[PDB]
Write a protein that binds this ligand. Structure first.
Ligand SMILES: *[C@@H]1O[C@H](CO)[C@@H](O)[C@H](O)[C@H]1NC(C)=O
Ligand SMILES: *[C@@H]1O[C@H](CO)[C@@H](O)[C@H](O)[C@H]1NC(C)=O
Ligand SMILES: *[C@@H]1O[C@H](CO)[C@@H](O)[C@H](O)[C@H]1NC(C)=O
Ligand SMILES: *[C@@H]1O[C@H](CO)[C@@H](O)[C@H](O)[C@H]1NC(C)=O
Ligand SMILES: *[C@@H]1O[C@H](CO)[C@@H](O)[C@H](O)[C@H]1NC(C)=O
Ligand SMILES: *[C@@H]1O[C@H](CO)[C@@H](O)[C@H](O)[C@H]1NC(C)=O
Ligand SMILES: *[C@@H]1O[C@H](CO)[C@@H](O)[C@H](O)[C@H]1NC(C)=O
Ligand SMILES: *[C@@H]1O[C@H](CO)[C@@H](O)[C@H](O)[C@H]1NC(C)=O
Ligand SMILES: *[C@@H]1O[C@H](CO)[C@@H](O)[C@H](O)[C@H]1NC(C)=O
Ligand SMILES: *[C@@H]1O[C@H](CO)[C@@H](O)[C@H](O)[C@H]1NC(C)=O
Lengths: 246, 171, 214, 49
C-alpha cells in the first residue's frame, strides 16, 4: 500500500502495481544484485570519500614536510640551533623558523577551514536528501535519482552516506495518434486526466505513464465548451452509461 | 626558493584542483542529458514562434539570436597562463540545443530516460493542469497566448539589446 | 609598428613591463617579446595498465622538438583519430585522449553524445506500456576527520627559548587552536544534523512478510 | 613579500571558486527543476506560477 500510494503520487493507477507485482519484485531484486556487483567488483565508484581523505592526507603530510624546511636559517632542527648559538645570537634564526612555520600553520588552518566549509555545504545537501529522498516522496526531477522517484534507502559510510534511490523508469513505448478533444453533439470533451488516443479504430482515453485504454465517457471526460474553438477536435461518439440503463 | 620548502607544489596543486572543480561545475551543469536531440524545423507549434530561441542554421555558429546578443554584448606572460576551458561555447550551445529540442518535443518525459513525443499544446495543457488551471482555458485562448508569448520574447530581446544592466553579474 | 616620440627611447606596458623600445643607435621602434614558455604535462593511463607515455605542452606549438597541434598546445606521442568518442581524460578545447587501437594512445575531439532525431508530428504521441524499476546509487560525503595540532609543540618542540620567543608573538597558537576546535565541533554538528533525525529506535519484526522484497 | 601576496591571491581565488560552486549547484538544480520539470515551488523558477 506504500508503493500504491507512491504510484498514485506519480500519477500512475495502482492497478498496475497489483497486476505486475512479481515483475516489480524480480526487477527490484535484480537491481539490488546489480548494485552489489557494481560495488563489489567495480571499486572505482567511491571517489567521493577517498578524494577527501587523500586531500586531508596531502595537507597533513605537507604540514609535516614543512618542519625540515630551512626557511633561510642555518638548520631546520631547533635543538642544534639551541646547542650552537647564543640566546642573543639565536634570535634571528629562531625568528626565521617561527615565521616560516607560523606561515605554514596559517596555510594549513585556512585550507582546513575552507575545505570544512565545502564539506558542511555538502552535509546540508545530504541531510536535505535524507529529509526528502528517504524520509518522504519528492516530485523534484533529478533530485532523488534519475527518473520518476518512489523512495530511497540510506547506508552508512566512513565520513559519508549512500542513498539507494528506488526510481521509476518507463521502458516500452509505441507511436500513437492523438487528438486534443472529441466532438459529440456540439458538446466538446476534454479528458479529466489523460489523453485521447486512437489505435486506428476508436478514440480511447488512457494514462500518461502506462498505456491502458479507458472507454471514453462522461464518467471519464470533462464536458465543456463547443465544437468550434478547439484546434484538433475530432468526431467520435462519447459513450453514455445512462442509455443502456434507462 | 629551493630552500623555502614546498610552497610551489602546494600552490600548483591548489590551482589545478581549482581548474578541475571548474570542469566539474560546467559538466554537472551542462551534462543533464546524454542523448543529443535535434529540433525538427516542422513548425506546427500552434502559432508559437521560437525563432529567437531555436538554433539558426542561417548562421554557422549554431545558436539563437539571444545567445549571439549575449556574446556580442559582453566583453600576463610571466607564467600567468590562462588555461583553456574544456567544453567550448559551441559544445554547450549544442547541449542547450538538445535541451530545447527535448523541452519542445518530449516536455519532461525524456527526463526519465528515453524521449516520448507529445504535441506542444498538450504540454501546455498539462502545465496548466499542474498549477490548477483547467486545460480548457488553453484551448479556448490559444492565439492570445501566442501573441503574449512572442511579444514577451520581443520585449526581452529589446531589454537585452538596448540595456546591459542584467549582464554585470557575469562581469 | 608602434610610434614613439623622437626623445622616447623605450616604454612600459599596461602592466608596467618593458614591452617596446627604440634602439639607441638607430631610430626604429622595436618591441620586446617574451620567449616560448609553457607547462609540461603528461598524458598516460595507469602504471597498472601500461608504460606508454604521451607528452602535452601547454599553450604553445611544437617548437623545441606525432606533431599534433591543438588549441591547448603542442601534443606529441599520441594518435589523431577522426572517430570522435567520449572524453576519457580531459586536456582542453574539447579534445581528449584515451587508450584505444594492438592498442596505444590516441587523441580525438570529445563526442558530445549519441545524436538522436526524436520524431514529431501534429498528432503522433508516444505512450509507455512497460516499465523498469532501476535503483541508482548516490555517494555523498558528510564529515571530515577531527584534527587538533598543538601549535606550540609544533613550532617549538621541547624548547624554552623558542617558547619565550613565541610568547612574544601574541596569541596566534591560541587563535589557531580555537579555530580548529570550532571546526571539530561543527563536524559533529554535521553528523548529528544528518543522522540524528528520529529520536526513536525502530527495528523490524522477525516475520519479514514483504511481498517478495528481499 | 611576493610569496605572501601570491598566497593571498590563491586564498581569494579559492573563496571565489567555492562561491561559484554554490552558484553552480543552484544552476544545475534549476536546470533539473525549472527546465526539465514543472516545479510547484513558489519563486524557485522566477516570479509567478
Ligand atoms: C515512431 O516513428 C518514428 C518515425 O521516424 C520512428 O523513428 C520510431 O522508431 C517509431 N517508434 C515506434 C515505437 O514505433
Ligand atoms: C483498437 O482497439 C479496439 C478495442 O477493442 C479493437 O477492437 C481494435 O481491433 C483495435 N485496433 C487495432 C488496429 O489494434
Ligand atoms: C496536422 O498538421 C497540419 C500541418 O501540416 C495542421 O494544419 C493540422 O491542423 C494538423 N492536424 C490537427 C488535427 O491539428
Ligand atoms: C464532424 O461532424 C460535423 C457534423 O456534425 C461535420 O460538419 C464536420 O465536418 C466533421 N468534422 C470533420 C473534421 O470532418
Ligand atoms: C518569428 O519572428 C521572426 C522575427 O524575429 C520572423 O522573422 C519569423 O518569420 C517569425 N516566424 C513565425 C513562424 O512567425
Ligand atoms: C595490475 O597489473 C597486473 C599485471 O601487471 C594485472 O594482472 C592486474 O589485474 C592489474 N590490477 C588490476 C586491479 O587490474
Ligand atoms: C606556432 O604558431 C605560430 C602562429 O600561431 C607560428 O607563427 C609559428 O611558426 C608556429 N611554430 C611552430 C613551431 O609550429
Ligand atoms: C581524417 O579524415 C580526413 C578526411 O576527412 C583524412 O584526410 C585524414 O587523413 C583522416 N585522419 C587520419 C589520421 O587518417
Ligand atoms: C515487461 O518486460 C518484461 C521483461 O521480461 C516482461 O517479462 C513483461 O511481461 C513485460 N510486461 C509488459 C506489460 O509488457
Ligand atoms: C535474498 O538475497 C540473498 C543474497 O542473494 C539470499 O542469500 C537470500 O536467501 C535472499 N532472501 C530472500 C528471501 O529473497
Amino acid at each position: 500500500m506504500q508503493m500504491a500510494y507512491r504510484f498514485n503520487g506519480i500519477g500512475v493507477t495502482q492497478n498496475v502495481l497489483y497486476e505486475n507485482q512479481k515483475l516489480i519484485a524480480n526487477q527490484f531484486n535484480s537491481a539490488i544484485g546489480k548494485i552489489q556487483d557494481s560495488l563489489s567488483s567495480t571499486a572505482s565508484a567511491l571517489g567521493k570519500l577517498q578524494d577527501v581523505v587523500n586531500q586531508n592526507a596531502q595537507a597533513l603530510n605537507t604540514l609535516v614536510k614543512q618542519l625540515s624546511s630551512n626557511f633561510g636559517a642555518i638548520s631546520s632542527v631547533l635543538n642544534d640551533i639551541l646547542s650552537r648559538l647564543d640566546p642573543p645570537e639565536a634570535e634571528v634564526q629562531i625568528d626565521r623558523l617561527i615565521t616560516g612555520r607560523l606561515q605554514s600553520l596559517q596555510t594549513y588552518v585556512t585550507q582546513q577551514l575552507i575545505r570544512a566549509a565545502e564539506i558542511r555545504a555538502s552535509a546540508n545537501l545530504a541531510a536535505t536528501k535524507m529529509s526528502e529522498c528517504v524520509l518522504g516522496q519528492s516530485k523534484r526531477v533529478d533530485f532523488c535519482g534519475k527518473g520518476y522517484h518512489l523512495m530511497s534507502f540510506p547506508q552508512s559510510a566512513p565520513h559519508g552516506v549512500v542513498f539507494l534511490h528506488v526510481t521509476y523508469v518507463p521502458a516500452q513505448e509505441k507511436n500513437f495518434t492523438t487528438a486534443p478533444a472529441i466532438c459529440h453533439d456540439g458538446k466538446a470533451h476534454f479528458p479529466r486526466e489523460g489523453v485521447f488516443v486512437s489505435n486506428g479504430t476508436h478514440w480511447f482515453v488512457t494514462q500518461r505513464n502506462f498505456y491502458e485504454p479507458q472507454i471514453i465517457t462522461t464518467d471519464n471526460t470533462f464536458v465543456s465548451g463547443n465544437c468550434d474553438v478547439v484546434i484538433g477536435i475530432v468526431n467520435n461518439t462519447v459513450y453514455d452509461p445512462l442509455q443502456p440503463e434507462l | 626558493l629551493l630552500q623555502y620548502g614546498s610552497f610551489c607544489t602546494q600552490l600548483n596543486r591548489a590551482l589545478t584542483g581549482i581548474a578541475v572543480e571548474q570542469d566539474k561545475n560546467t559538466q554537472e551543469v551542462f551534462a543533464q542529458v546524454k542523448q543529443i536531440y535535434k529540433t525538427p524545423p516542422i513548425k506546427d507549434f500552434g502559432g508559437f514562434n521560437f525563432s529567437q530561441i531555436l538554433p539558426d542554421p542561417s548562421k554557422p555558429s549554431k545558436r539563437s539570436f539571444i545567445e549571439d546578443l549575449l556574446f556580442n554584448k559582453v566583453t600576463k606572460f610571466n607564467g600567468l597562463t590562462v588555461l583553456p576551458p574544456l567544453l567550448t561555447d559551441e559544445m554547450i550551445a549544442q547541449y542547450t540545443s538538445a535541451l530545447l529540442a527535448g523541452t519542445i518535443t518530449s516536455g519532461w518525459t525524456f527526463g526519465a530516460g528515453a524521449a516520448l513525443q507529445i504535441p506542444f499544446a498538450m504540454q501546455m495543457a498539462y502545465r496548466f493542469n499542474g498549477i490548477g488551471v483547467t486545460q480548457n482555458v488553453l484551448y479556448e485562448n490559444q492565439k492570445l497566448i501566442a501573441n503574449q508569448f512572442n511579444s514577451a520574447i520581443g520585449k526581452i530581446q529589446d531589454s537585452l539589446s538596448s540595456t546591459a544592466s542584467a549582464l554585470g553579474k557575469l562581469q | 609598428n608602434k610610434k614613439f616620440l623622437p626623445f622616447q627611447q623605450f616604454g612600459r606596458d599596461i602592466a608596467d613591463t618593458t614591452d617596446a623600445v627604440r634602439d639607441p643607435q638607430t631610430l626604429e621602434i622595436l618591441d620586446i617579446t617574451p620567449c616560448s614558455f609553457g607547462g609540461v604535462s603528461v598524458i598516460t593511463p595507469g602504471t597498472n595498465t601500461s608504460n606508454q607515455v604521451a607528452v602535452l605542452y601547454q599553450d604553445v606549438n611544437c617548437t623545441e622538438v606525432n606533431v599534433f597541434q591543438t588549441r591547448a598546445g603542442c601534443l606529441i606521442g599520441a594518435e589523431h583519430v577522426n572517430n570522435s568518442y567520449e572524453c576519457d581524460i580531459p586536456i582542453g578545447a574539447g579534445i581528449c585522449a584515451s587508450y584505444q587501437t594492438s592498442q596505444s594512445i590516441i587523441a580525438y575531439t570529445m563526442s558530445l553524445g549519441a545524436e538522436n532525431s526524436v520524431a514529431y508530428s501534429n498528432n503522433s504521441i508516444a505512450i509507455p506500456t512497460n516499465f523498469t524499476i532501476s535503483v541508482t546509487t548516490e555517494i555523498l560525503p558528510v564529515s571530515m576527520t577531527k584534527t587538533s595540532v598543538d601549535c606550540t609543540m609544533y613550532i617549538c618542540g621541547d624548547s624554552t627559548e623558542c617558547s619565550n620567543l613565541l610568547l612574544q608573538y601574541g596569541s596566534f597558537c591560541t587563535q589557531l587552536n580555537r579555530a580548529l576546535t570550532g571546526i571539530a565541533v561543527e563536524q559533529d554538528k554535521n553528523t548529528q544534523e544528518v543522522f540524528a533525525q528520529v529520536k526513536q529506535i525502530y527495528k523490524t519484526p522477525p516475520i519479514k512478510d514483504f511481498g517478495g522484497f528481499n
